[PDB]
Design an enzyme around this catalytic site. Sequence first.
Site, mmCIF file in Angstrom:
data_model
loop_
_atom_site.group_PDB
_atom_site.id
_atom_site.type_symbol
_atom_site.label_atom_id
_atom_site.label_comp_id
_atom_site.label_asym_id
_atom_site.label_seq_id
_atom_site.Cartn_x
_atom_site.Cartn_y
_atom_site.Cartn_z
ATOM 1 N N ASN A 164 70.972 69.680 73.472
ATOM 2 C CA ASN A 164 69.784 69.628 74.317
ATOM 3 C C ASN A 164 69.761 70.931 75.053
ATOM 4 O O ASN A 164 69.923 70.978 76.266
ATOM 5 C CB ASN A 164 69.861 68.435 75.269
ATOM 6 C CG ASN A 164 68.571 68.083 75.979
ATOM 7 O OD1 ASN A 164 67.603 68.864 76.048
ATOM 8 N ND2 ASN A 164 68.545 66.899 76.558
ATOM 9 N N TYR A 171 69.564 73.348 83.485
ATOM 10 C CA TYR A 171 70.739 73.076 84.317
ATOM 11 C C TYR A 171 71.462 74.390 84.707
ATOM 12 O O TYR A 171 71.760 74.590 85.890
ATOM 13 C CB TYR A 171 71.706 72.161 83.542
ATOM 14 C CG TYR A 171 71.203 70.745 83.407
ATOM 15 C CD1 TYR A 171 70.555 70.119 84.454
ATOM 16 C CD2 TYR A 171 71.430 70.011 82.250
ATOM 17 C CE1 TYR A 171 70.183 68.782 84.377
ATOM 18 C CE2 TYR A 171 70.984 68.701 82.128
ATOM 19 C CZ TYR A 171 70.375 68.082 83.204
ATOM 20 O OH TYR A 171 69.993 66.762 83.148
#
Lengths: 197, 197
Positions: A164, A171
């Site tokens: 992902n 992030y």
Amino acid sequence: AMEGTLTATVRLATPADAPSIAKLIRELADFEELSHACVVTEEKLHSSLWKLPPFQGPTVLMLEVCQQVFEPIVRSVVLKNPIDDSAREGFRSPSTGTHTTVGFVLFFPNYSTFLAKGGYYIEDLYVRKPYRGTGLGTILLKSVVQQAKKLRAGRVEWCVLDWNVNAIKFYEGLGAKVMPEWRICRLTGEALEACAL
Amino acid sequence: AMEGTLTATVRLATPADAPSIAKLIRELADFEELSHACVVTEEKLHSSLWKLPPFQGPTVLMLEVCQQVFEPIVRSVVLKNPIDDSAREGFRSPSTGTHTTVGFVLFFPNYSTFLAKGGYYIEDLYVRKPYRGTGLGTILLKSVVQQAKKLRAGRVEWCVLDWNVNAIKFYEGLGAKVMPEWRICRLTGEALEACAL
Ligand SMILES: CC(=O)SCCNC(=O)CCNC(=O)[C@H](O)C(C)(C)COP(=O)(O)OP(=O)(O)OC[C@H]1O[C@@H](n2cnc3c(N)ncnc32)[C@H](O)[C@@H]1OP(=O)(O)O
Ligand SMILES: CC(=O)SCCNC(=O)CCNC(=O)[C@H](O)C(C)(C)COP(=O)(O)OP(=O)(O)OC[C@H]1O[C@@H](n2cnc3c(N)ncnc32)[C@H](O)[C@@H]1OP(=O)(O)O
């Protein structure tokens, strides 16, 4: 269809949000292609969430938009591109009728043995497809980090599927470090029931 | 020196175990060679543990030995080898003067949104060098798993270093599955301090 600027609101979920959360959990399971492993129901959410005070057990924050312990976080967002939401009537907010539910985050406390201090672990973070890529996921995650720091957390942690890359970049775009040396072990189903002294 | 059979007891830690827990955490950090990143003190333990009911937040179970809610697990253990423990006097148990503290396990509730059920995550599990290789660490782990099943946990989880293939083998043998695609992300220090809305 939605153009210009929107008002995003991040707020604590109440039992009335259980149906929207069940829907968003189901959509999140499809995104990870684990829809067969997802057996969430509203009754299961009522049986497991809202048992302990917020931030002391599994806690959910809802993310809702409109146009123009934890106090709601309200921020304006200039849309990167117009938003075509063909499911807004199915995600009408139960709290403020004129808001659309577009996301949720579920997190709970964790603990660092070496810091001898509690932190927070983010289990799930999801934003509906029409609302991605315009700053909404950032507001939502930052809202959890904000409260965690208010509660003097040592670390905020979460997991990520190594494929992902969209979430990886997102992030790491917030200062987080993806640790390459840790693997999760899970004992569940038959093996958990069979594990005995 | 210690031969034949010992009696092993797994019990809930109380605030009186903080001096042994801090010593055992220092030994664990020393083993993983992360002692500089280990800032545990008894005061930190008193400020972060024993604040919520056991099994509802960060919980520690102590493992102790002798030669003759959570109820203590008492089991007889056949010694695979004689045990020579020169640190015995430094690890005298508070609960009973004739008991020797040999280990601990720290764990806290987690949550699976796909199951819509609370589970448990084992953060650290340690056994002192003189007592390894005779079944005590297994009793400690299975003691947490047994209580987790009694509390109807959906899963029991922990982390393993990806190169620790011996641990992967042992966990796999227990029925646990090492997930290949999951990575832990951590936001801490100056990045956590800078992360603001
Ligand atoms: C275990 C888990 O739950 S992992 C959680 C991830 N979940 C998923 O992958 C499910 C599907 N994906 C999603 O729901 C979402 O896309 C999320 C949660 C990953 C991110 O939410 P989004 O709203 O898409 O993210 P957001 O728009 O805030 O930020 C992403 C990017 O936009 C940038 N950005 C930040 N602020 C803004 C802004 N104001 N306007 C536009 N872009 C912005 C970031 O720098 C980041 O850049 P990059 O990805 O190119 O490196
Ligand atoms: C679940 C966790 O978080 S464990 C991760 C931390 N473990 C460490 O490596 C810390 C240092 N080591 C120790 O304290 C111990 O040796 C433990 C905690 C691993 C348990 O070991 P023992 O008391 O020896 O286990 P036991 O005698 O029941 O089992 C026989 C063998 O099974 C394996 N095993 C048992 N429990 C574990 C465990 N938790 N993790 C990995 N392997 C294990 C070991 O190979 C063990 O032999 P060893 O002591 O020579 O390493």
